[PDB]
């Protein structure tokens, strides 16, 4: 079976991976990497990796340098946790000290082991201030040198009263989960048209920027409607699919998913994509879905 590891780095990334643990992603192994020993005690994520001593200067933990130095000190533990994976996902909320600085170290450890590495990260809300935004962008520059594909979700693009801080980050958590689940479950729980992992590697390895959209529909034309909804999703509104060197598509549904629906989704995606590129369409089986069919589209090698 495939070995797929999902690593939440820092507080924001740990929170996103905790959401993935609660909502489930089939067949993946979850890890939390953090300088914050208290966060590692509290997390429901089953495997934790302490980086650095866990002993803090006041406000020192906000510098990405602290997260970078901590991860570098514990590169042996990172390597030992990642060794043997077929794919690694790195989730982080960029802008703090630990995610921003440690996530590129985790990514490079995986890259140097030869593991297909995909990062799905957020940028801070503008209200968090320019300093955090500058830290985040510098961290994304560094992360981009060490990953195969990078999906960057600006919190400002996703999102009132009754909206708590917990609720505000829940929106990001759902998108990060959708990207990880959409890619991984093609491998860990295939449906009638099983994707070949070499096709996943083809569209994700050393590709650069990527972006995800998703849609879901029920009824007679569910396949068309879900695919069209994914292409028209707010995250892909600015990305022409025919500018993507790769396109990965996950159709998720129950036992009733039909070959004609696979063909229809493929026709729709190929209508919008280019043909000087590589397209990969796979399926996942979710036995608890009745009526509904979800389409997740990951455009890779955009720029
Ligand atoms: N998804 C998510 N993002 C968060 C959360 N808390 C903060 N963030 C975002 O992630 C960034 C860094 O988070 P923080 O906990 O301060 O530092 P970290 O330990 O390096 O992750 C922040 O600037 C926020 O944009 C959270 O609970 N969930």
Residue numbers in the entry: 10 to 65, 67 to 169, 173 to 316
Authors' account:
FtsZ, a bacterial homolog of tubulin, assembles onto a ring-like scaffold called the Z-ring, which serves as the foundation for cell division by the divisome. The N-terminal subdomain contains the binding site for GTP, and the C-terminal subdomain has, by analogy with tubulin protofilaments, key catalytic residues that contact the GTP in the subunit below to initiate GTP hydrolysis. Strikingly, although E. coli has provided the most detailed understanding of the machinery and mechanism of bacterial cell division, the structure of the E. coli FtsZ (EcFtsZ) protein has remained elusive. Here, we report the 1.35 and 1.40 Å resolution structures of E. coli FtsZ(L178E) bound to GDP and GTP, respectively.
Du and coworkers focused on one mutant, L178E, which they confirmed to be assembly-incompetent in the presence of GTP. They also found that EcFtsZ(L178E) lost its tendency to aggregate when bound to GDP, as determined by size-exclusion chromatography. The EcFtsZ(L178E) protein, which previous studies had indicated to be a monomer in the presence of GDP or GTP, produced well diffracting crystals in the presence of GDP and, when optimized, permitted us to collect data to 1.35 Å resolution. One clear solution was obtained, consistent with the presence of one EcFtsZ(L178E) molecule in the crystallographic asymmetric unit. In spite of evidence that the L178E mutation in EcFtsZ inhibits assembly, the crystals showed that EcFtsZ(L178E) assembled into straight protofilaments, as noted in the previous study of Du et al.. However, comparison of the EcFtsZ(L178E) filament with the SaFtsZ filament reveals that the EcFtsZ filament is much looser (see below for the buried surface areas). While the residues in the EcFtsZ(L178E) loops from residues 63 to 70 and 168 to 178 make somewhat similar interactions with neighboring subunits to those observed in the SaFtsZ filament, they are more surface-exposed in the EcFtsZ(L178E) crystal filament and their relatively high B factors (the average B factors for residues 63–70 and residues 168–178 are 56.9 and 45.5 Å2, respectively, compared with the overall average protein B factor of 23.9 Å2) indicate they are somewhat flexible. Presumably, as the residue corresponding to Leu178 in SaFtsZ is wedged into a hydrophobic pocket of an adjacent subunit in the SaFtsZ filament, the similar burial of the Glu178 side chain into the hydrophobic pocket in the EcFtsZ(L178E) filament is predicted to be unfavorable. As a result, the EcFtsZ(L178E) protofilaments have a more open subunit interface. Our analyses show that the EcFtsZ(L178E) structure adopts the R state and as such has a closed cleft between its N-terminal and C-terminal subdomains.
